[PDB]
Give the backbone structure.
Amino acid sequence: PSMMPQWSYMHISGQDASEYLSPGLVQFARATETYFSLNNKFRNPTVA
Amino acid sequence: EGYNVAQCNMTKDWFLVQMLANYNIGYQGFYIPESYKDRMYSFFRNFQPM
């Protein structure tokens, strides 16, 4: 389970959540934001 | 037997219903609703258990 610098694998750094999901899932999430949350399940890393 | 909440006499079910219908909260665990979405004649503001 260590075929890459593990930081990307654990989302310490790399691309944001809205760009590593099956886009259907993102459509589903943005389509039901109000009455059922999902936006606090995956972290988008930040890099200085 | 098993149907009080917040050390009051109220049932869990009624509490859940009121929380939902007042703020769409409860399915994701309760917590104090934010200020602006809770005005003077709200529900949670005037909930005194004794």
In short: The first helix of chain A runs from residue 6 to 9. Chain A touches chain B through four residues (CB under 8 Å). The helical segments of chain A are 6-9, 23-31.
